Design an enzyme around this catalytic site. Structure first.
Site, PDB file in Angstrom:
ATOM      1  CG  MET A 197      -7.378   1.118   0.747  1.00 32.01           C
ATOM      2  SD  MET A 197      -5.733   0.386   0.788  1.00 32.01           S
ATOM      3  CE  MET A 197      -4.966   1.361   2.089  1.00 32.01           C
TER       4      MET A 197
ATOM      5  CG  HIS B 198      -5.022  -1.028  -3.407  1.00 30.89           C
ATOM      6  ND1 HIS B 198      -4.120  -1.205  -2.365  1.00 30.89           N
ATOM      7  CD2 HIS B 198      -4.850  -2.094  -4.250  1.00 30.89           C
ATOM      8  CE1 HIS B 198      -3.456  -2.336  -2.554  1.00 30.89           C
ATOM      9  NE2 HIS B 198      -3.857  -2.880  -3.694  1.00 30.89           N
TER      10      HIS B 198
ATOM     11  CG  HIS C  27      -1.844  -1.189   1.310  1.00 24.92           C
ATOM     12  ND1 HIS C  27      -2.982  -1.263   0.549  1.00 24.92           N
ATOM     13  CD2 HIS C  27      -1.771  -2.373   1.995  1.00 24.92           C
ATOM     14  CE1 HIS C  27      -3.616  -2.417   0.766  1.00 24.92           C
ATOM     15  NE2 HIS C  27      -2.898  -3.100   1.634  1.00 24.92           N
TER      16      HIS C  27
ATOM     17  CG  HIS D 150      -6.255  14.369  -4.337  1.00 29.18           C
ATOM     18  ND1 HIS D 150      -7.511  14.347  -4.922  1.00 29.18           N
ATOM     19  CD2 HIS D 150      -5.585  13.253  -4.785  1.00 29.18           C
ATOM     20  CE1 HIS D 150      -7.619  13.233  -5.641  1.00 29.18           C
ATOM     21  NE2 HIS D 150      -6.481  12.551  -5.572  1.00 29.18           N
TER      22      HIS D 150
ATOM     23  CD  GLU E  71     -32.956  22.522  -6.164  1.00 27.15           C
ATOM     24  OE1 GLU E  71     -34.064  21.944  -5.976  1.00 27.15           O
ATOM     25  OE2 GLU E  71     -32.884  23.293  -7.142  1.00 27.15           O
ATOM     26  CB  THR E  72     -29.133  19.268  -5.280  1.00 28.77           C
ATOM     27  OG1 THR E  72     -30.356  18.756  -4.747  1.00 28.77           O
ATOM     28  CG2 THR E  72     -28.349  18.033  -5.759  1.00 28.77           C
TER      29      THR E  72
ATOM     30  CG  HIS F 207     -31.413  17.285  -1.552  1.00 30.64           C
ATOM     31  ND1 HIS F 207     -31.724  18.536  -2.003  1.00 30.64           N
ATOM     32  CD2 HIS F 207     -32.558  16.836  -0.965  1.00 30.64           C
ATOM     33  CE1 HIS F 207     -32.956  18.856  -1.609  1.00 30.64           C
ATOM     34  NE2 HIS F 207     -33.506  17.817  -1.000  1.00 30.64           N
TER      35      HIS F 207
ATOM     36  CG  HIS G 150      -6.531   8.175  -3.599  1.00 28.52           C
ATOM     37  ND1 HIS G 150      -5.757   7.428  -4.480  1.00 28.52           N
ATOM     38  CD2 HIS G 150      -6.735   9.376  -4.189  1.00 28.52           C
ATOM     39  CE1 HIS G 150      -5.472   8.167  -5.567  1.00 28.52           C
ATOM     40  NE2 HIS G 150      -6.052   9.351  -5.408  1.00 28.52           N
ATOM     41  CB  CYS G 151      -4.279   3.224  -1.142  1.00 30.48           C
ATOM     42  SG  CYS G 151      -2.996   1.999  -1.441  1.00 30.48           S
TER      43      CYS G 151
ATOM     44  CG  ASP H  86      -2.173  10.853  -4.475  1.00 28.70           C
ATOM     45  OD1 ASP H  86      -2.156  12.047  -4.100  1.00 28.70           O
ATOM     46  OD2 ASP H  86      -2.447  10.651  -5.675  1.00 28.70           O
TER      47      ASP H  86
ATOM     48  CG  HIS I  26     -31.819  14.714  -5.253  1.00 26.57           C
ATOM     49  ND1 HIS I  26     -32.680  14.332  -6.227  1.00 26.57           N
ATOM     50  CD2 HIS I  26     -32.610  15.338  -4.306  1.00 26.57           C
ATOM     51  CE1 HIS I  26     -33.934  14.672  -5.940  1.00 26.57           C
ATOM     52  NE2 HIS I  26     -33.911  15.233  -4.747  1.00 26.57           N
TER      53      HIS I  26
HETATM   54 CL   LIG Z   1     -35.244  14.107  -2.185  1.00 28.05          CL
HETATM   55 CL   LIG Z   2      -5.133  10.039  -8.509  1.00 23.76          CL
HETATM   56 CU   LIG Z   3      -3.745  -0.008  -0.897  1.00 24.57          CU
HETATM   57 CU   LIG Z   4     -35.588  15.828  -3.587  1.00 28.91          CU
HETATM   58 CU   LIG Z   5      -6.200  10.956  -6.758  1.00 23.63          CU
END
Ligand SMILES: [Cl-]
Ligand SMILES: [Cl-]
Ligand SMILES: [Cu+2]
Ligand SMILES: [Cu+2]
Ligand SMILES: [Cu+2]
Ligand SMILES: [Cl-]
Ligand SMILES: [Cu+2]
Ligand SMILES: [Cu+2]
Ligand SMILES: [Cu+2]
Lengths: 336, 336, 336
Positions: free
Chosen positions: C144, C139, C89, C94, C273-274, C249, C129-130, C92, C300
């Site tokens: 992960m 992975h 493993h 970001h 709303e969303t 949502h 993430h891995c 990374d 949603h």
């Molecule tokens: Cl809804």
């Molecule tokens: Cl990536």
């Molecule tokens: Cu991994």
């Molecule tokens: Cu809705």
């Molecule tokens: Cu990434």
């Protein structure tokens, strides 16, 4: 600001793609705006081959009608579920606060009605949809959604605070449909709404729609039913998608001012070629037409638009402007 | 501002991933910039197993070349469809106004050419693509799209109006491909373009691409074809997707300034980890490299990137900076 | 600002959906914040039918725990891969710069550990993430990933510079899972992690998840495990998706202030709303509850939420406010 002491007014709704008459900027103080909608379960034909859908609607149309109020108004809605229907329904407004959007307070069986009131305190275009406990996705993808538009009391503005005005408003509801196919490769036709249930939920689980239509059917906004405008007119295009993402585009035009997340207290973006409506939301765009001619308005996943049906037409009158675009040499043989 | 009285200049286009020479900020007044493109229908190999695609291109490449002008300039394009091709083509510019983006005025059959002019009045990166009546999705997903970049006359700016400058520009076109499989589980190889039609449209309707590639093939931007930069250089990364959404990410870097909807009159967002290009649009990001090493640029649906092909490399020279990142203890046995 | 001379402090991580104690605005200068995580490969039950997943985690949970620091701090992480695990493993971030996010410097086989340090110079919520060479997508979709939250030293602000404060923070990781089905139509159960590999990669290539869950299983954030709040409290909802888009949502509520691209140096949008989280990113929203009751928080696309599992509950105490919403007439027979 106690709604029980405000003036009450009744509004008559109109069918999409039109929107009921309303003011943009207004000098009125808050009021209670009363509306009524009736649910209609009905079979409809959605394409040119005879494919049917066991549909569920608000007021008989897909999408349901657009409701228009101003920020600070109260919305009072009477929802009627006639005894000709077979299922229980309700309504969830994304523009409201509390009780699952009002869905906990509007559960009506066939033969019942109920009346809800809520403060429309946030400006923007918001989805409303049915949401019965345990059957939510099915009632939504069978047709039960529409838009509530809450205008700022001062109307729409650009990022610097300058006023924006539209001459016409059109409402478009886009619907991803999941119509089951039988063992002979043809779409199935069901005698009743309940019979379609089990096959339909299995197609929904693939996440792949059979059809994706504007306003209830393939070609609903073409031919004699195309939207109309003239050069110099400013149009408001409201687009709702209650379950799946979409990416609207006007072929030959642009989004001059767009609220893709649909909430009018945020500044719009300008000059967009293609914008994005998140599933479970409504958005709005303004455009002022500069050239006459037929325009196509569509979902710019082109397979969704031209193979599955998500496309419509706008027919625009006026005079052609060669300073914006000119054919210098028409198609002709390559010179040898 | 009558284009017939402006100065005319001819530009020579270059193949992706490079972009033809141009100024950012400029003291020039508007001009008519003339371009020529020739359509090429050709079979190509898109992966390391020999899978072929019956492709359709502008100027032989996927994507077609990037065209660069300044806001207020006029674009004059001569589109040539040689008589070695089998189908009719045209061009729709999302950056133009009227006549379906110019597609109504550029319909050329094999053996024909046509010349269009349009005012580039809106700044930003815009898609251009083929769009023949009744065959739109197929010409686009077979390769026919590219980017038109309209720079503000004063160059790119940050949200507070401060100037932004790039040292190099690279253009990336991302293509969702729909290659049919036969009854033995292998991808099919077709003798002619027309023969691939019917199987291909059936795969498009599933909405599930077989492959998703940057610039025409799996691994096109890796190895000897990786993009190159050095520490301290600022790069402009233009990314177009004419049919399907994508979400670009630079592994080990960021988007310092990003216009994800691609329209330069709107303020950019900063510090993005991953941004979003809507299908049917082009977007742009700026990054200044601070560390040397190999970087991957990819669609951050990781299955799309690593299983279906949407990933490329950037190779960056310079000196490592331990204040930004340092290995404190290399991998070693856990202490007992 | 040389990290070797700064004060070092150790933090104890907590399991989702809680977030470890931290300050918002702070008067502290930069420091080196030390964390430790241990990888755990384990089988888990993800639904109410007994379906299992051969999962891979950071610290035993899906998602891994949220790490919180302030802009300008240094993150020092010790990653431990115990010899009870079978695979190699790495990690990374970001939020980091260089060496593929730190993945090139943290490659640990079972029985090894490694320690990385990086400057957290950009504010926002970022995925970690891995990413082991050649096995990246597997992975990540097996569990992960988690979130690193880098707060501005002055805390969160609205678009006009006014301070925003939250009373509670909750972290939600959303996971698209690809569980293979056997020839009898039932989900397969594997004895070891390695055995699941080959069937799993074939399901990933369809791009259609079998299940989509919040925090490791269907119904993880419901019943006794629902999130809790009271009227008048302001909550921060952090949502991460490391591989696929999602559109959050809150039913009955809104996003009062939302950073959908998750980067705190950009102004938030209001009244959403969303909203939309791009695959490979984390975003954040603030909401102040105004009504008591059960709320649902979900993706949603309603089929993804209610059929595939991406939904959770928030239980809110306090007093009902009839000025925001009132039932005028409860469901009753239509008047004849
Ligand atoms: Cl809804
Ligand atoms: Cl990536
Ligand atoms: Cu991994
Ligand atoms: Cu809705
Ligand atoms: Cu990434
Ligand atoms: Cl188009
Ligand atoms: Cu219903
Ligand atoms: Cu073509
Ligand atoms: Cu287009």
């Amino acid at each position: 600001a106690d709604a029980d002491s405000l003036p009450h007014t009744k509004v008559t709704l109109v069918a999409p793609p039109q929107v009921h008459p309303h003011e943009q900027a207004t000098a009125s103080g808050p009021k209670v705006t009363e509306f009524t909608m009736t649910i209609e379960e009905k079979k409809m034909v959605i394409d040119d081959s005879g494919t049917t859908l066991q549909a569920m609607t608000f007021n008989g149309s897909m999408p349901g009608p657009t409701l228009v109020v101003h920020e600070g108004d109260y919305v009072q809605l009477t929802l009627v579920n006639p005894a000709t229907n077979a299922m229980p329904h309700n309504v969830d407004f994304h523009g409201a606060t509390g009780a699952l959007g009002g869905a906990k307070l509007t559960n009506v069986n066939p033969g019942e009605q109920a009346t809800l009131r809520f403060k429309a305190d946030r400006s923007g275009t918001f989805v409303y949809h049915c949401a019965p406990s345990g059957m939510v996705p099915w009632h939504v993808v069978s047709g039960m959604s529409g838009t509530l538009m809450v205008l700022p009391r001062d109307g729409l503005k650009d990022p610097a605070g300058a006023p924006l005005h539209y001459d016409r408003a059109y409402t478009i509801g886009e619907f991803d449909l999941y119509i089951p196919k039988g063992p002979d490769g043809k779409y199935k036709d069901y005698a009743t709404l309940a019979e379609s249930y089990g096959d339909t939920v299995q197609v929904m689980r693939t996440l792949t729609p059979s059809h994706i239509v504007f306003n209830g059917k393939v070609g609903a906004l073409t031919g004699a039913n195309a939207l109309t405008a003239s050069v110099g007119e400013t149009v408001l295009l409201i687009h709702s998608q209650a379950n799946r993402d979409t990416r609207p585009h006007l072929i030959g035009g642009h989004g001059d001012w767009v609220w893709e997340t649909g909430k009018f207290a945020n500044p719009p973006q300008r000059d967009l070629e293609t914008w994005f409506i998140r599933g479970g939301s409504a958005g709005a765009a303004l455009y002022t037409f500069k050239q006459p001619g037929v325009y196509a308005y569509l979902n710019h996943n082109l397979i969704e638009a031209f193979e599955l049906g998500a496309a419509g037409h706008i027919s625009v009158e006026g005079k052609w402007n060669d300073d914006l675009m000119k054919q210098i040499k028409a198609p002709a043989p390559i010179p040898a």
